[PDB]
Design a protein around this ligand. Structure first.
Ligand SMILES: [Cl-]
Ligand SMILES: [Cl-]
Ligand SMILES: [Cl-]
Ligand code: NA
Length: 129
């Protein structure tokens, strides 16, 4: 599923991401835009052989099991395919674990390089929340 901007903002707010660990909603929408272009089915392979999955591009090196990343962890206790669903619940619940691990949203390279320090509230402007 490719979400609209405000559709995704509303879904993330319903799932408790607004101000989660101090990150306002616009941060999460900005991160999803640049990680996946709002596409739940996005996948991208990393140099080390791991793969990033879904709207927030969560990495099989640490967070999910895809059966093909030897020596990796599965800290969210889910198959990586669950992160491609049109229902964002699994991605949001796993993202909550990632952001709480000590590095905040710096875990998402696109957030650090394209959202951090910008006017992220612009990403939720006009949306009915
Ligand atoms: Cl915001
Ligand atoms: Cl594996
Ligand atoms: Cl933080
Ligand atoms: Na894994």
């Amino acid at each position: 599923k490719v979400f609209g901007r405000c559709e995704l903002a509303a879904a993330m707010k319903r799932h408790g991401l607004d101000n989660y660990r101090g990150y306002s909603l616009g941060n999460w929408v900005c991160a999803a835009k640049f990680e996946s272009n709002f596409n739940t089915q996005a996948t991208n392979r990393n140099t080390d052989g791991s793969t990033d999955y879904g709207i927030l591009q969560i990495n099989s090196r640490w967070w999910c099991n895809d059966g093909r990343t030897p020596g990796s962890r599965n800290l969210c206790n889910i198959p990586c395919s669950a992160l491609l669903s049109s229902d964002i619940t699994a991605s949001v619940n796993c993202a909550k674990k990632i952001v709480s691990d000590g590095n905040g949203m710096n875990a998402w390279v696109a957030w650090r390089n394209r959202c951090k320090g910008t006017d992220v509230q612009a990403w939720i402007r006009g949306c009915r929340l």
